[PDB]
C-alpha cells in the first residue's frame, strides 16, 4: 500500500523504476534491500524485470508506458529491446519511437485513460502514442513547467501535482484528467513529485525520507488505504 524504500542511497524511486498495473521495471545495479521491497509486496502477480535502457540505470525517466504498451527511446540497443519482449507478457506491445525529446518519462505523463505530453512534441509521435498505448493525448502544462513527467504523478484514482501551483490551473486540469488533484510535496519537501514516487492501484512506493504527514496526503488522494492479529494478552 504505502511502502517506502530507497535505491543505493538515493530516496527517489521514479528515476529508477516504472510501475504499472501489469508489469514493473527495475534497474540492475541494486542491492537486495531494494528488490525485496517490490518482490515481497507484489509477489508473483506481476513480473518484475531487471533491465537497462540505453546503457543507463535511469529507466524510470527514459521509458513511458501503461497497461497496454511500453515506449522506448531511440538509443535503446536491440539487445535490451529483444530482452524486454521475452520477460514481459504478450499483452503489452513495445515500439521504439524516433524523437528529438529522447527522455520519454519526463515528456509523457500517462495512465490507463488520459495522457499529458510535452507541448513541443510533434504530430508524428501523437499519432503513435494513441496507437500503441491506446490513450487520447492532450498537450497541457502544469502552471509553470513544461516537463509533465517529473512534476505530475498520475494514476487511475487520482493524481499528485506540483506544489507551487495555482488553484484555477488545477481545476482546469481536473476537468481534463477527470481525476481529483492535490498539490503537495514528497521526500521531506522535494518539489519533484513525479520522480519522487511510483504509483498504481495496489501499491505506491516512495522514498525513505518522506515524512509522516506527507505519506498521509499520498495515500488519501490515491485511496489505497482501507487486523485481528493485534490485541492485548496480559
Amino acid at each position: 500500500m504505502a511502502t517506502r524504500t530507497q535505491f543505493e542511497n538515493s530516496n527517489e524511486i521514479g528515476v529508477f523504476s516504472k510501475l504499472t498495473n501489469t508489469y514493473c521495471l527495475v534497474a540492475v545495479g541494486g542491492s537486495e534491500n531494494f528488490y525485496s521491497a517490490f518482490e515481497a509486496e507484489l509477489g508473483d502477480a506481476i513480473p518484475i524485470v531487471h533491465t537497462t535502457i540505453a546503457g543507463t540505470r535511469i529507466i524510470g525517466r527514459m521509458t513511458a508506458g501503461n497497461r497496454r504498451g511500453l515506449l522506448v527511446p531511440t538509443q535503446t540497443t536491440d539487445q535490451e529491446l529483444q530482452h524486454l519482449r521475452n520477460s514481459l507478457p504478450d499483452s503489452v506491445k513495445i515500439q521504439r519511437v524516433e524523437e528529438r525529446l529522447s527522455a520519454l518519462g519526463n515528456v509523457i505523463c500517462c495512465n490507463d485513460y488520459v495522457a499529458l505530453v510535452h507541448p513541443d512534441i510533434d504530430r508524428e509521435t501523437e499519432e503513435l502514442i494513441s496507437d500503441v498505448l491506446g490513450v487520447e493525448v492532450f498537450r497541457q502544462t502544469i502552471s509553470g513547467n513544461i516537463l509533465v513527467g517529473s512534476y505530475c504523478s498520475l494514476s487511475n484514482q487520482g493524481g499528485l501535482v506540483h506544489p507551487q501551483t495555482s488553484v484555477q490551473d488545477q481545476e482546469e486540469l481536473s476537468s481534463l484528467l477527470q481525476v481529483p488533484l492535490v498539490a503537495g510535496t514528497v521526500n521531506r519537501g522535494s518539489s519533484v513529485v513525479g520522480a519522487g514516487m511510483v504509483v498504481n492501484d495496489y501499491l505506491a512506493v516512495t522514498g525513505l525520507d518522506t515524512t509522516a504527514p506527507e505519506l498521509s496526503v499520498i495515500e488519501s488522494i490515491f485511496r489505497l488505504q482501507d487486523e485481528s492479529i493485534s490485541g492485548n494478552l496480559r
Partner: protein, 128 residues
C-alpha cells in the same frame, strides 16, 4: 477524538492501536529528574548537565498479541524486537526504566521509538 493506529514504516503493519498509551505526559522540570546527569566513578562527582528534549520520543504501550512469542521464547530482562515482516530495530523492551527523551521514568515498560514508525488515524480521511 477518534481511534488511531501506529503503523510501521517499511513493514506496513499495525503495531499498536489506541486503547493503550500510558502517555505519562508532564515531565518533572526540576534538577534531579528533568535533567540528565552523568556521574563519575567516585564520591557522586557530576561531570555533565544535559537538558531534556521537548517531546517524549517513545511509546509506552501494553504487551500485545504479536509480542507473545518473543516475550515467552527466551525471556530475558532486556532486549528488543521487530516488525513481523522486515526484522528492523523497531522498539525494545526493558524491565528497568529508559524515561523518555524528555524524561520522566516509567515502569518496567515496552518502549517504542517514534523514529521509523508513524501514527495514522484509524477513522476516515482528513478531507482538506
Amino acid at each position: 477524538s477518534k481511534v488511531t493506529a501506529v503503523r510501521c514504516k517499511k513493514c506496513r503493519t499495525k503495531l499498536a492501536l489506541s486503547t493503550s498509551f500510558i502517555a505519562h505526559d508532564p515531565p518533572s522540570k526540576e534538577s534531579s529528574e528533568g535533567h540528565f546527569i552523568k556521574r563519575a566513578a567516585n564520591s557522586h562527582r557530576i561531570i555533565d548537565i544535559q537538558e531534556s528534549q521537548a517531546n517524549c520520543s517513545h511509546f509506552f504501550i501494553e504487551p500485545l498479541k504479536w509480542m507473545q512469542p518473543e516475550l515467552q521464547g527466551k525471556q530475558e530482562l532486556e532486549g528488543k524486537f521487530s516488525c513481523p515482516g522486515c526484522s528492523s530495530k523497531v522498539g525494545g523492551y526493558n524491565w528497568k526504566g529508559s524515561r523518555c527523551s524528555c524524561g520522566k521514568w516509567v515502569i518496567p515498560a515496552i518502549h517504542l521509538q517514534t523514529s521509523k514508525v508513524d501514527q495514522f488515524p484509524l477513522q476516515s480521511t482528513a478531507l482538506p
